[PDB]
Structure formats: C-alpha cells, structure tokens
Amino acid sequence: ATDDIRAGELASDWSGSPDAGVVFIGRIHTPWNRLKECPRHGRADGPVCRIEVFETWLPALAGIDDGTLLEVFYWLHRSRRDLLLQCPRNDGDARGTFSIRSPLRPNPIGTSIARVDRRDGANLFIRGLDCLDGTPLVDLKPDRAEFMP
Amino acid sequence: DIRAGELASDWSGSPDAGVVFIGRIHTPWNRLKECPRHGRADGPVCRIEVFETWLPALAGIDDGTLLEVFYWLHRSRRDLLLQCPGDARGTFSIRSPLRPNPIGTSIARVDRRDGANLFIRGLDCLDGTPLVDLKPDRAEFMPLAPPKPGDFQVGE
Numbered sequence A: 001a002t003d004d005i006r007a008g009e010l011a012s013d014w015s016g017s018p019d020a021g022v023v024f025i026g027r028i029h030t031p032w033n034r035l036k037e038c039p040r041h042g043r044a045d046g047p048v049c050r051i052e053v054f055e056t057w058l059p060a061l062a063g064i065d066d067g068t069l070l071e072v073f074y075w076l077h078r079s080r081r082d083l084l085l086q087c088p089r090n091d092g093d094a095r096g097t098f099s100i101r102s103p104l105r106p107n108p109i110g111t112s113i114a115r116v117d118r119r120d121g122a123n124l125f126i127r128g129l130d131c132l133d134g135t136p137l138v139d140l141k142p143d144r145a146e147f148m149p
Numbered sequence B: 001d002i003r004a005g006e007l008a009s010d011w012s013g014s015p016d017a018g019v020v021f022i023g024r025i026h027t028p029w030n031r032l033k034e035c036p037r038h039g040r041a042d043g044p045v046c047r048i049e050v051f052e053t054w055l056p057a058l059a060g061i062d063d064g065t066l067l068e069v070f071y072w073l074h075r076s077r078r079d080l081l082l083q084c085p086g087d088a089r090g091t092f093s094i095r096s097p098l099r100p101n102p103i104g105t106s107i108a109r110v111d112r113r114d115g116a117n118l119f120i121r122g123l124d125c126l127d128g129t130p131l132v133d134l135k136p137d138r139a140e141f142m143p144l145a146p147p148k149p150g151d152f153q154v155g156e
C-alpha cells in the first residue's frame, strides 16, 4: 500500500465524485522515468523536453513559436489526492497541502514556467519542466511577465 | 456561435480525469462584463471559502501569505481555438478564460484568514466561481523537499 503516510501527516477519508472533467490536450516527454529522478522544480537551463500537443488543439498554438515563455499546466497522474498534512522532509514537520507546492494535492495540477526552444508543428521543444515522461498536458498559457510586462 | 475570424473545434469526447471543487470564491462581480480582465492588488476584497473537507490543508496559510489561486472558469465554452479577445489569436497564446480546460489563476496576498475563509484582493472571477487549488506563490516560497538528481541536470 502506497497508502501508508509519514509520521505527522494526515489523509482525508473523503470519497465524493468529481465536479468537472479535465481533457488531456497533449503528452509531455522528458528524460525522467522515475519520480525519484525528477527535479523538484524545473530549471530554465535544464534538458530539452518535448510537449506533444494533440491534433484537435493544434490551431490553438497559433502565436506560440521559438522563444515563447509559457506557463505549462500538467496533470500529476501518479499522485494520491487525499493528503491534508504532508511532511516533505519526513521529519515530522507537517505542513498543510495548500502551504506547499507538493505534487500530492486534491487536484494534482502542476505548473512550470518554461521557454520554448523550438517549435515544430505540434511539438514544443522546451526547457524548464520537472515531470515524469508521459505526463498529461492540461493547459498552456503565455507567462505573465512576458505577456503582460 | 462565434465571431468572424474565430475558429472552434468540433471535438466531442469524454474527460480523462476529474476535478473536485474544493471551495467557492465570493466576489463583487455578478456579471462577466463587470469582472476585471486580470486581478489587481488594490482591487475589492473577495472571500475564498474552502470547503470543510479541506480546511486542515490550510495549515500554514495566514494573514500575509502570498498565494497562487487556481479556479475553474465554470461559465466558459471550451471549444475555441482562435479567439478575438484586432486579429484572432491562438487560445494557448493568450490568457482567455475560454480554454479546453478553463483553469484560471491569480497571484494574490491573503489580507486576513478566518477559519476556512481567506479574505484577499487581486482576483478577477465571477461571484461563485469554483476553487480548484491553492499554492504558495513562487516569489515567496522555498521548496522544502531535499534536492533530487533532476535538480542538478543542465541541458546540452
């Protein structure tokens, strides 16, 4: 059971159904096949990853090209969703889930601010991600600092 | 039903995952045209109501905490690919509330915490918008977990 929690942690017994549905709009390809190999957070000088946007949404890439700084939203598909208190250092220092950027969340939405190296059709070659190879894409937006000074 | 120059997808498939509404955001704006395009730090005070189930997860958030607030734009059509928010633009190239997954964010500082309620300025959503996540904003958060090999990996 990946169900066990660390000392100091707290899991919710909540078992309701979802209120809305998320569509996976692409797939993110990265160097990392194991969670323990992933960066905690991406770095802008990091390895090139490839965001493959699915064919339905290709026209929505209009305006994104080489160099565009993006806020990339992805679904952390391996994460449990029930933790309320977490101890990211496994030392009994428990923090509310909303006070940390842990991938374990009620809605496991991850973001990275990441600049497109190169675009080739549906593929965005991009630096600055931190997710497992094959992580689902859920949204792309222009980063605030570049889009709105 | 769209403007000349826009493009919609005629895609109709089931969702791949489910989103849980963890709260509700209470704001001054009852109509879409009343909402600011983006939130401002000196805008009207709003109330983020976190539902009972997730109250314990607010531990560590208090007056003065800088948050990244994620909400579900529940009134948005999800099919637009080119939009005229002026030449039409790709949906992914703008911060429009009309998106395949209509997730909005605002970066805003908690003015006051009271139990499951956060009183906060800098939002832009319709009164009654569902909350989907809260994170400490990057500008004021330092990751707690220890470094991993990926943290040291620089690209060629």
Ligand SMILES: C[S@@+](CC[C@H](N)C(=O)[O-])C[C@H]1O[C@@H](n2cnc3c(N)ncnc32)[C@H](O)[C@@H]1O
Pocket (backbone or CB within 6 Å): A035, A036, A038, A039, A040, A041, A042, A075, A076, A077, A078, A079, A101, A102, A103, A109, A110, A111, A112, A130, A131, A132, A135, A136
């Ligand atoms: C700390 S989270 C930060 C996510 C994002 N940078 C953010 O701030 O929202 C990054 C971690 O999520 C984990 N992870 C990466 N891909 C994942 C996936 N697809 N499902 C669940 N966990 C994942 C890895 O342990 C990685 O180190």
Ligand SMILES: C[S@@+](CC[C@H](N)C(=O)[O-])C[C@H]1O[C@@H](n2cnc3c(N)ncnc32)[C@H](O)[C@@H]1O
Pocket (backbone or CB within 6 Å): B032, B033, B035, B036, B037, B038, B039, B072, B073, B074, B075, B076, B095, B096, B097, B103, B104, B105, B106, B124, B125, B126, B129, B130
């Ligand atoms: C331009 S979007 C930006 C959202 C967020 N600040 C971001 O950058 O991700 C803000 C607009 O979304 C619209 N809106 C607000 N709440 C909504 C809701 N619940 N459903 C659909 N549209 C909404 C309003 O027109 C508002 O001006």
